[PDB]
Amino acid sequence: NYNKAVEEEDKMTPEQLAIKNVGKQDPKRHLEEHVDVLMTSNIVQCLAAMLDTVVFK
Amino acid sequence: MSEKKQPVDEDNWDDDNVEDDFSNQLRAELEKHGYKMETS
Amino acid sequence: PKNPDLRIAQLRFLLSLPEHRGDAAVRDELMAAVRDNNMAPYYEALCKSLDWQIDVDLLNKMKKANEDELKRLDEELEDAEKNLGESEIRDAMMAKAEYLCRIGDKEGALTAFRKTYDKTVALGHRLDIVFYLLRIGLFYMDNDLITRNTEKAKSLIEEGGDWDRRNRLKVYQGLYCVAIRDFKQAAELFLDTVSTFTSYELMDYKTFVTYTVYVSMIALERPDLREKVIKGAEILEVLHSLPAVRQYLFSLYECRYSVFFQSLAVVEQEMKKDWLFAPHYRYYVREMRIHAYSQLLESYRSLTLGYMAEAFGVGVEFIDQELSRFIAAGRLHCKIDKVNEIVETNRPDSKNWQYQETIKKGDLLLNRVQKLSRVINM
Amino acid sequence: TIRDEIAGCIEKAYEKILFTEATRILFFNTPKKMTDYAKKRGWVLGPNNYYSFASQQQKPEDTTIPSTELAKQVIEYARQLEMIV
Amino acid sequence: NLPKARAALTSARTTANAIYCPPKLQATLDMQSGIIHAAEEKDWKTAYSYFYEAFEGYDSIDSPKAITSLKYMLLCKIMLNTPEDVQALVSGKLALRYAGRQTEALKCVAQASKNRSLADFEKALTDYRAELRDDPIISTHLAKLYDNLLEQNLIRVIEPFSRVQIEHISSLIKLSKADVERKLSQMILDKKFHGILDQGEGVLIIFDEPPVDKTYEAALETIQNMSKVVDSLYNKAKKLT
Amino acid sequence: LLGEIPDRLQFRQPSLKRSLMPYFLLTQAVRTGNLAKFNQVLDQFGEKFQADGTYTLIIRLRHNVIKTGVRMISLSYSRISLADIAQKLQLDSPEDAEFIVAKAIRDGVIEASINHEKGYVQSKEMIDIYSTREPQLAFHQRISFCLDIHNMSVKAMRFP
């Protein structure tokens, strides 16, 4: 839900960056912070799932 | 492109991809499927 | 002022596929020639139907009386422009002179459409143009003119509201949605139903009910299929008047497959003998089958085709190649065992194959921005 | 190059093919080639028939080991997630 | 004749407001609106509500006409089984006014609607057969009941344990393959029943398992992402050339 | 030559149309297993193929279509008998059908078991591909494809 349902509210902003074109005040950067959060969110889940391969054997 | 030897040598068109499968198979079909009524 | 000539287009398809009656279609065509002053309607029918003998002076004194009625409207252009008024002078040279398109060919059409187009201050007169472009494109099978005028009709007339002629547009594009292939928007624009009531351009509303009910058995899903007819008030009384259509509607919900092959042929008879349904009936046949076969195979995980012979009455080798040609085309993926008389369900689309739309459509997507990334720079 | 394909092509996998049915392709009458097949194939030499036992053949599971290498696949996969990072 | 009944009803639409005061027309038209529209099977509660409106307008009129008015409205409560208006009408002071013989048999019919209970419904079916004849449509009223009351007793037997043999569970409904199991096969289609049968060994298996959660939340967002790049393709080709 | 192709008019252009008409109905005869229809396409439309120089495949494409025809039937049915698929694919004889199915197993095309008496072919549904196996193993190539483009975007970003 944070990796999908948050995507559409994040990926509407590039369609909001399309004006079109161009009557709306620019620039605006919506890239952060969800992108890097979901990155680290996998970094939490990948190395915690490595506990299967790390702890065991 | 146009270099090398490149230059040297809804719609119904979209449905025609599926429609041609009707041409070589089972016609449409009404009459035959309508004849199958009294067959058995 | 359409249906009398709009039925000549019905006579064209009545002459087109069946060759049986050439006299019955030419009598009411000549009856439509002796009235309404039709010229080209019997000229393009003169090649399809019999070449008489003689029409000529019988219908030439008409086109002369037409010319007398054409010249008096062409005399009305410089007689009314002698005075001055807003839109009133040149409004007489559109509706009746584009009624001369109904007389013959495109001469009345093309020259009277653009000649009156710039003056009109009201959207109702601009749509009468678009109207008469839709009838000539119904008469002659050319699909060009009826696509462009509707695009011009949506911009100007919809600005803006109207009750009457705007509901006709939703019928036109809906009729265009069934003229070309669109299932979902056909019945969606037909949702207006009796709000359009009956008009010269709406022909018989009971026939308009037949047009929307035949698309509503595919595009309108089974939960919504029974909903629109039963919960819908104004649409329910007109379907109960027809015992043939209402039967097949409820029998579809009753799931009995014995009455389908009979009643579906009755619908196909109307689908065969109606214009603009000739290219579109081929996929319509087995699309109502898979619609009945969708709920079929969803019922049991293991089903014997001999039990299907009961309902089908009696499918043995018929559904053997039939259901096999459904799977090969991607319609209703299923496993039916041969000579073992078992059908297997499946296919669990809730997990595996449903994931594939992500990367597959995302391949050409990301590929398009790979190549176009190497373009910047150079 | 065709003769050695009678053993290779026809199976795997068929159940049982009768004596004279295999002789129809091999022609001759009762050659030592089919006798050499009874040695080479092995497979089976049945009376008036040939058998594929047992069974069809070797009954592949295939293996319960690949669960190991599946954990090996996650090793470099989680490493690629750390390369970005 | 439904179209002829509505045509006679349509002519009454402008007839009620034609004269000065009906004196009773629209109220009678409401009962007539509870006939054709009820034949249309529009809404069970609204048509039953027109009988309540007519019953409010039936006060101080001929008693034989009023004593047969409860024949239609209280037996209309039989078809619905969920009017929710049960206690409103019959327990009010206006509906308790009739002590006559014919309405006393109707008072227990209004109680028979509160009963349901196919053990009792099949019993009183013979006792009320006289009132069953006065039913305007005898089949449809009790067909929608018997078809609905079918699964009412079926959801009782199938509920307690997950999987059941199809031969004995359909022995209480007296048969299997012809209609029941085909109607039960329609229950998966109507979503009222989640499960699957077994034709060979005769064991009905119920599984609610296979959810759809993560998947449609993924691919459907990517289909929208196809509109992000295609719409950006206009920006791409425009700035470059 | 892949054996899996749809109708190619979805790639057609009004300018390319007139030129692809002899090459159009070709693939329309590939989707079907009829010999009389396939050989008639080679006779009439073989003139257009002379300029392309594509005649190398026409001898091996007959073996390609018979694989598409049997894949259409094998995917549509659990069991498929050799005698019923004999004339349906018009192999006309039981003996060459044993040769085709044998080479079909050699190419990994079909999983069908065969019970030889007359004989007949009795197959079964192939499963266990499931979920935990193929998608996550394929995703190793998907992400390795995607994470490289992250570098491709950085490299393209470093030039400006």
PDB file of C-alpha atoms in Angstrom, chain C residues 95-288:
ATOM      1  CA  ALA C  95     -33.005  22.877 -44.359  1.00  0.00           C
ATOM      2  CA  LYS C  96     -35.043  22.749 -47.579  1.00  0.00           C
ATOM      3  CA  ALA C  97     -32.037  22.943 -49.913  1.00  0.00           C
ATOM      4  CA  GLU C  98     -30.246  20.226 -47.948  1.00  0.00           C
ATOM      5  CA  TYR C  99     -33.555  18.430 -48.259  1.00  0.00           C
ATOM      6  CA  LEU C 100     -32.540  18.589 -51.929  1.00  0.00           C
ATOM      7  CA  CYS C 101     -29.593  16.405 -50.943  1.00  0.00           C
ATOM      8  CA  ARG C 102     -32.372  13.959 -50.098  1.00  0.00           C
ATOM      9  CA  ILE C 103     -33.532  14.526 -53.692  1.00  0.00           C
ATOM     10  CA  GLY C 104     -30.243  13.478 -55.284  1.00  0.00           C
ATOM     11  CA  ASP C 105     -26.501  12.736 -55.109  1.00  0.00           C
ATOM     12  CA  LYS C 106     -24.110  14.947 -53.128  1.00  0.00           C
ATOM     13  CA  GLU C 107     -24.912  18.114 -55.100  1.00  0.00           C
ATOM     14  CA  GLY C 108     -27.520  19.178 -52.570  1.00  0.00           C
ATOM     15  CA  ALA C 109     -25.207  18.017 -49.774  1.00  0.00           C
ATOM     16  CA  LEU C 110     -21.810  19.558 -50.437  1.00  0.00           C
ATOM     17  CA  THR C 111     -22.809  22.939 -51.866  1.00  0.00           C
ATOM     18  CA  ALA C 112     -25.646  23.694 -49.428  1.00  0.00           C
ATOM     19  CA  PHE C 113     -23.695  22.581 -46.342  1.00  0.00           C
ATOM     20  CA  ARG C 114     -20.788  25.023 -46.591  1.00  0.00           C
ATOM     21  CA  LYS C 115     -22.894  27.777 -48.164  1.00  0.00           C
ATOM     22  CA  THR C 116     -25.099  28.166 -45.064  1.00  0.00           C
ATOM     23  CA  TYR C 117     -22.416  27.245 -42.521  1.00  0.00           C
ATOM     24  CA  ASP C 118     -20.827  30.631 -41.813  1.00  0.00           C
ATOM     25  CA  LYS C 119     -24.014  32.616 -41.142  1.00  0.00           C
ATOM     26  CA  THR C 120     -25.811  30.490 -38.552  1.00  0.00           C
ATOM     27  CA  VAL C 121     -25.875  32.106 -35.109  1.00  0.00           C
ATOM     28  CA  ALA C 122     -27.534  29.105 -33.409  1.00  0.00           C
ATOM     29  CA  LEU C 123     -26.124  25.645 -32.709  1.00  0.00           C
ATOM     30  CA  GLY C 124     -29.395  23.989 -33.747  1.00  0.00           C
ATOM     31  CA  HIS C 125     -28.932  24.965 -37.390  1.00  0.00           C
ATOM     32  CA  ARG C 126     -25.301  23.821 -37.417  1.00  0.00           C
ATOM     33  CA  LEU C 127     -26.471  20.413 -36.184  1.00  0.00           C
ATOM     34  CA  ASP C 128     -29.101  20.116 -38.922  1.00  0.00           C
ATOM     35  CA  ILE C 129     -26.040  20.192 -41.190  1.00  0.00           C
ATOM     36  CA  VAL C 130     -24.371  17.404 -39.192  1.00  0.00           C
ATOM     37  CA  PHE C 131     -27.749  15.643 -39.262  1.00  0.00           C
ATOM     38  CA  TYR C 132     -27.978  15.588 -43.063  1.00  0.00           C
ATOM     39  CA  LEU C 133     -24.350  14.437 -43.251  1.00  0.00           C
ATOM     40  CA  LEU C 134     -25.251  11.432 -41.089  1.00  0.00           C
ATOM     41  CA  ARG C 135     -28.081  10.337 -43.381  1.00  0.00           C
ATOM     42  CA  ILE C 136     -26.071  10.504 -46.616  1.00  0.00           C
ATOM     43  CA  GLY C 137     -23.349   8.480 -44.903  1.00  0.00           C
ATOM     44  CA  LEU C 138     -26.027   5.988 -43.895  1.00  0.00           C
ATOM     45  CA  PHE C 139     -27.426   5.828 -47.447  1.00  0.00           C
ATOM     46  CA  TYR C 140     -24.026   5.464 -49.121  1.00  0.00           C
ATOM     47  CA  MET C 141     -21.774   3.169 -47.083  1.00  0.00           C
ATOM     48  CA  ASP C 142     -18.910   5.694 -47.062  1.00  0.00           C
ATOM     49  CA  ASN C 143     -17.864   6.199 -43.432  1.00  0.00           C
ATOM     50  CA  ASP C 144     -15.909   9.450 -43.934  1.00  0.00           C
ATOM     51  CA  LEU C 145     -18.537  12.185 -43.706  1.00  0.00           C
ATOM     52  CA  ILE C 146     -20.275  10.817 -40.598  1.00  0.00           C
ATOM     53  CA  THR C 147     -17.058  10.781 -38.545  1.00  0.00           C
ATOM     54  CA  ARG C 148     -16.044  14.401 -39.141  1.00  0.00           C
ATOM     55  CA  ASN C 149     -19.428  16.095 -38.686  1.00  0.00           C
ATOM     56  CA  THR C 150     -19.908  14.491 -35.262  1.00  0.00           C
ATOM     57  CA  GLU C 151     -16.515  15.877 -34.242  1.00  0.00           C
ATOM     58  CA  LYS C 152     -17.724  19.309 -35.357  1.00  0.00           C
ATOM     59  CA  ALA C 153     -21.000  18.704 -33.515  1.00  0.00           C
ATOM     60  CA  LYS C 154     -19.377  17.962 -30.153  1.00  0.00           C
ATOM     61  CA  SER C 155     -17.286  21.144 -30.051  1.00  0.00           C
ATOM     62  CA  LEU C 156     -19.862  23.801 -30.952  1.00  0.00           C
ATOM     63  CA  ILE C 157     -23.180  22.463 -29.634  1.00  0.00           C
ATOM     64  CA  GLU C 158     -21.917  21.036 -26.310  1.00  0.00           C
ATOM     65  CA  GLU C 159     -20.441  24.352 -25.121  1.00  0.00           C
ATOM     66  CA  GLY C 160     -23.136  24.752 -23.573  1.00  0.00           C
ATOM     67  CA  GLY C 161     -26.185  22.570 -22.991  1.00  0.00           C
ATOM     68  CA  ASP C 162     -29.265  21.346 -24.730  1.00  0.00           C
ATOM     69  CA  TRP C 163     -31.854  18.722 -23.859  1.00  0.00           C
ATOM     70  CA  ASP C 164     -33.091  17.646 -27.296  1.00  0.00           C
ATOM     71  CA  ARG C 165     -30.429  17.581 -30.007  1.00  0.00           C
ATOM     72  CA  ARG C 166     -27.578  16.755 -27.606  1.00  0.00           C
ATOM     73  CA  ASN C 167     -29.205  13.463 -26.589  1.00  0.00           C
ATOM     74  CA  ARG C 168     -29.276  12.679 -30.311  1.00  0.00           C
ATOM     75  CA  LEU C 169     -25.478  13.011 -30.469  1.00  0.00           C
ATOM     76  CA  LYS C 170     -25.081  10.347 -27.780  1.00  0.00           C
ATOM     77  CA  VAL C 171     -27.250   8.182 -30.039  1.00  0.00           C
ATOM     78  CA  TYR C 172     -25.171   9.028 -33.116  1.00  0.00           C
ATOM     79  CA  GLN C 173     -21.800   8.151 -31.593  1.00  0.00           C
ATOM     80  CA  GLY C 174     -23.475   5.174 -29.925  1.00  0.00           C
ATOM     81  CA  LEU C 175     -24.723   4.170 -33.364  1.00  0.00           C
ATOM     82  CA  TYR C 176     -21.186   4.847 -34.592  1.00  0.00           C
ATOM     83  CA  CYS C 177     -19.850   2.775 -31.689  1.00  0.00           C
ATOM     84  CA  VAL C 178     -21.967  -0.082 -33.031  1.00  0.00           C
ATOM     85  CA  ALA C 179     -21.132   0.936 -36.618  1.00  0.00           C
ATOM     86  CA  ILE C 180     -17.439   0.359 -35.938  1.00  0.00           C
ATOM     87  CA  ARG C 181     -16.426  -1.970 -33.088  1.00  0.00           C
ATOM     88  CA  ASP C 182     -16.967  -0.457 -29.661  1.00  0.00           C
ATOM     89  CA  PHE C 183     -18.929  -2.552 -27.163  1.00  0.00           C
ATOM     90  CA  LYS C 184     -18.354  -0.654 -23.919  1.00  0.00           C
ATOM     91  CA  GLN C 185     -19.297   2.871 -25.035  1.00  0.00           C
ATOM     92  CA  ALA C 186     -22.178   1.703 -27.264  1.00  0.00           C
ATOM     93  CA  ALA C 187     -24.531   0.788 -24.414  1.00  0.00           C
ATOM     94  CA  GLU C 188     -22.920   3.481 -22.241  1.00  0.00           C
ATOM     95  CA  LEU C 189     -24.108   6.223 -24.605  1.00  0.00           C
ATOM     96  CA  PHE C 190     -27.382   4.296 -24.997  1.00  0.00           C
ATOM     97  CA  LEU C 191     -28.039   4.673 -21.249  1.00  0.00           C
ATOM     98  CA  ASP C 192     -30.181   7.745 -22.014  1.00  0.00           C
ATOM     99  CA  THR C 193     -32.988   5.424 -23.250  1.00  0.00           C
ATOM    100  CA  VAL C 194     -36.445   7.093 -23.282  1.00  0.00           C
ATOM    101  CA  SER C 195     -34.964  10.533 -22.525  1.00  0.00           C
ATOM    102  CA  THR C 196     -34.475  10.748 -26.301  1.00  0.00           C
ATOM    103  CA  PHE C 197     -38.084   9.511 -26.822  1.00  0.00           C
ATOM    104  CA  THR C 198     -38.851   9.043 -30.555  1.00  0.00           C
ATOM    105  CA  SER C 199     -37.674  11.243 -33.419  1.00  0.00           C
ATOM    106  CA  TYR C 200     -37.257  11.209 -37.190  1.00  0.00           C
ATOM    107  CA  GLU C 201     -33.543  10.574 -36.604  1.00  0.00           C
ATOM    108  CA  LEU C 202     -34.242   8.028 -33.842  1.00  0.00           C
ATOM    109  CA  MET C 203     -36.483   5.953 -36.191  1.00  0.00           C
ATOM    110  CA  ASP C 204     -38.531   3.426 -34.214  1.00  0.00           C
ATOM    111  CA  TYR C 205     -37.545   3.583 -30.549  1.00  0.00           C
ATOM    112  CA  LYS C 206     -38.475  -0.089 -30.114  1.00  0.00           C
ATOM    113  CA  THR C 207     -35.830  -0.833 -32.751  1.00  0.00           C
ATOM    114  CA  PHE C 208     -33.445   1.416 -30.816  1.00  0.00           C
ATOM    115  CA  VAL C 209     -34.207  -0.821 -27.838  1.00  0.00           C
ATOM    116  CA  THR C 210     -33.125  -3.797 -29.955  1.00  0.00           C
ATOM    117  CA  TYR C 211     -29.857  -2.053 -30.845  1.00  0.00           C
ATOM    118  CA  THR C 212     -28.942  -1.328 -27.222  1.00  0.00           C
ATOM    119  CA  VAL C 213     -30.045  -4.730 -25.897  1.00  0.00           C
ATOM    120  CA  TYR C 214     -27.826  -6.662 -28.320  1.00  0.00           C
ATOM    121  CA  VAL C 215     -24.716  -4.782 -27.189  1.00  0.00           C
ATOM    122  CA  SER C 216     -25.805  -5.013 -23.544  1.00  0.00           C
ATOM    123  CA  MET C 217     -25.468  -8.798 -23.522  1.00  0.00           C
ATOM    124  CA  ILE C 218     -21.676  -8.537 -23.969  1.00  0.00           C
ATOM    125  CA  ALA C 219     -20.378  -5.165 -22.768  1.00  0.00           C
ATOM    126  CA  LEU C 220     -22.767  -5.060 -19.782  1.00  0.00           C
ATOM    127  CA  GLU C 221     -21.585  -7.721 -17.346  1.00  0.00           C
ATOM    128  CA  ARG C 222     -23.965 -10.274 -15.794  1.00  0.00           C
ATOM    129  CA  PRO C 223     -24.294  -8.424 -12.437  1.00  0.00           C
ATOM    130  CA  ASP C 224     -25.072  -5.215 -14.345  1.00  0.00           C
ATOM    131  CA  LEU C 225     -26.892  -7.061 -17.162  1.00  0.00           C
ATOM    132  CA  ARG C 226     -29.832  -7.994 -14.942  1.00  0.00           C
ATOM    133  CA  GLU C 227     -29.492  -4.679 -13.088  1.00  0.00           C
ATOM    134  CA  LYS C 228     -30.161  -2.221 -15.929  1.00  0.00           C
ATOM    135  CA  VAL C 229     -33.244  -4.082 -17.173  1.00  0.00           C
ATOM    136  CA  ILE C 230     -34.822  -4.927 -13.806  1.00  0.00           C
ATOM    137  CA  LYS C 231     -33.875  -1.812 -11.830  1.00  0.00           C
ATOM    138  CA  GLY C 232     -34.162   0.463 -14.869  1.00  0.00           C
ATOM    139  CA  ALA C 233     -37.734   1.730 -15.019  1.00  0.00           C
ATOM    140  CA  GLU C 234     -38.377   3.173 -18.484  1.00  0.00           C
ATOM    141  CA  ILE C 235     -36.364   0.464 -20.252  1.00  0.00           C
ATOM    142  CA  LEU C 236     -38.199  -2.454 -18.619  1.00  0.00           C
ATOM    143  CA  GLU C 237     -41.641  -1.851 -20.149  1.00  0.00           C
ATOM    144  CA  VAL C 238     -40.378  -1.794 -23.739  1.00  0.00           C
ATOM    145  CA  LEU C 239     -38.538  -5.116 -23.402  1.00  0.00           C
ATOM    146  CA  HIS C 240     -41.558  -6.856 -21.851  1.00  0.00           C
ATOM    147  CA  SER C 241     -43.554  -5.942 -24.964  1.00  0.00           C
ATOM    148  CA  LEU C 242     -41.225  -8.159 -27.026  1.00  0.00           C
ATOM    149  CA  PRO C 243     -41.508 -11.789 -25.834  1.00  0.00           C
ATOM    150  CA  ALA C 244     -38.598 -12.938 -28.013  1.00  0.00           C
ATOM    151  CA  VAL C 245     -35.991 -10.527 -26.639  1.00  0.00           C
ATOM    152  CA  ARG C 246     -37.116 -10.657 -23.000  1.00  0.00           C
ATOM    153  CA  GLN C 247     -36.987 -14.468 -23.039  1.00  0.00           C
ATOM    154  CA  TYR C 248     -33.381 -14.622 -24.278  1.00  0.00           C
ATOM    155  CA  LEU C 249     -32.492 -11.929 -21.716  1.00  0.00           C
ATOM    156  CA  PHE C 250     -33.780 -13.873 -18.699  1.00  0.00           C
ATOM    157  CA  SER C 251     -32.785 -17.252 -20.176  1.00  0.00           C
ATOM    158  CA  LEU C 252     -29.231 -15.885 -20.250  1.00  0.00           C
ATOM    159  CA  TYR C 253     -29.555 -15.393 -16.494  1.00  0.00           C
ATOM    160  CA  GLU C 254     -31.307 -18.772 -16.249  1.00  0.00           C
ATOM    161  CA  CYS C 255     -28.153 -20.311 -17.856  1.00  0.00           C
ATOM    162  CA  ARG C 256     -30.114 -22.963 -19.810  1.00  0.00           C
ATOM    163  CA  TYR C 257     -28.152 -23.670 -22.986  1.00  0.00           C
ATOM    164  CA  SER C 258     -30.977 -25.497 -24.774  1.00  0.00           C
ATOM    165  CA  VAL C 259     -32.863 -22.324 -25.721  1.00  0.00           C
ATOM    166  CA  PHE C 260     -29.722 -20.316 -26.550  1.00  0.00           C
ATOM    167  CA  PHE C 261     -28.882 -21.870 -29.934  1.00  0.00           C
ATOM    168  CA  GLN C 262     -32.503 -21.270 -30.962  1.00  0.00           C
ATOM    169  CA  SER C 263     -33.046 -17.762 -29.586  1.00  0.00           C
ATOM    170  CA  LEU C 264     -29.519 -16.582 -30.464  1.00  0.00           C
ATOM    171  CA  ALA C 265     -30.274 -17.464 -34.085  1.00  0.00           C
ATOM    172  CA  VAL C 266     -33.427 -15.323 -33.911  1.00  0.00           C
ATOM    173  CA  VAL C 267     -31.232 -12.435 -32.763  1.00  0.00           C
ATOM    174  CA  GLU C 268     -28.774 -13.382 -35.512  1.00  0.00           C
ATOM    175  CA  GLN C 269     -31.620 -13.229 -38.044  1.00  0.00           C
ATOM    176  CA  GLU C 270     -32.077  -9.583 -37.083  1.00  0.00           C
ATOM    177  CA  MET C 271     -28.284  -9.254 -37.050  1.00  0.00           C
ATOM    178  CA  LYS C 272     -28.071 -10.736 -40.554  1.00  0.00           C
ATOM    179  CA  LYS C 273     -30.879  -8.690 -42.127  1.00  0.00           C
ATOM    180  CA  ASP C 274     -29.879  -5.336 -40.575  1.00  0.00           C
ATOM    181  CA  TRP C 275     -27.398  -2.938 -42.150  1.00  0.00           C
ATOM    182  CA  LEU C 276     -24.008  -2.092 -40.588  1.00  0.00           C
ATOM    183  CA  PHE C 277     -24.207  -5.385 -38.677  1.00  0.00           C
ATOM    184  CA  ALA C 278     -22.723  -7.385 -41.573  1.00  0.00           C
ATOM    185  CA  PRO C 279     -19.035  -6.930 -40.596  1.00  0.00           C
ATOM    186  CA  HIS C 280     -19.867  -7.098 -36.878  1.00  0.00           C
ATOM    187  CA  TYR C 281     -21.935 -10.288 -36.579  1.00  0.00           C
ATOM    188  CA  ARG C 282     -18.997 -12.675 -37.040  1.00  0.00           C
ATOM    189  CA  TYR C 283     -17.343 -11.993 -33.684  1.00  0.00           C
ATOM    190  CA  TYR C 284     -20.781 -11.447 -32.122  1.00  0.00           C
ATOM    191  CA  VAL C 285     -21.680 -15.140 -32.561  1.00  0.00           C
ATOM    192  CA  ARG C 286     -19.060 -16.766 -30.340  1.00  0.00           C
ATOM    193  CA  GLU C 287     -18.801 -13.752 -28.015  1.00  0.00           C
ATOM    194  CA  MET C 288     -22.275 -14.510 -26.675  1.00  0.00           C
TER     195      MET C 288
END
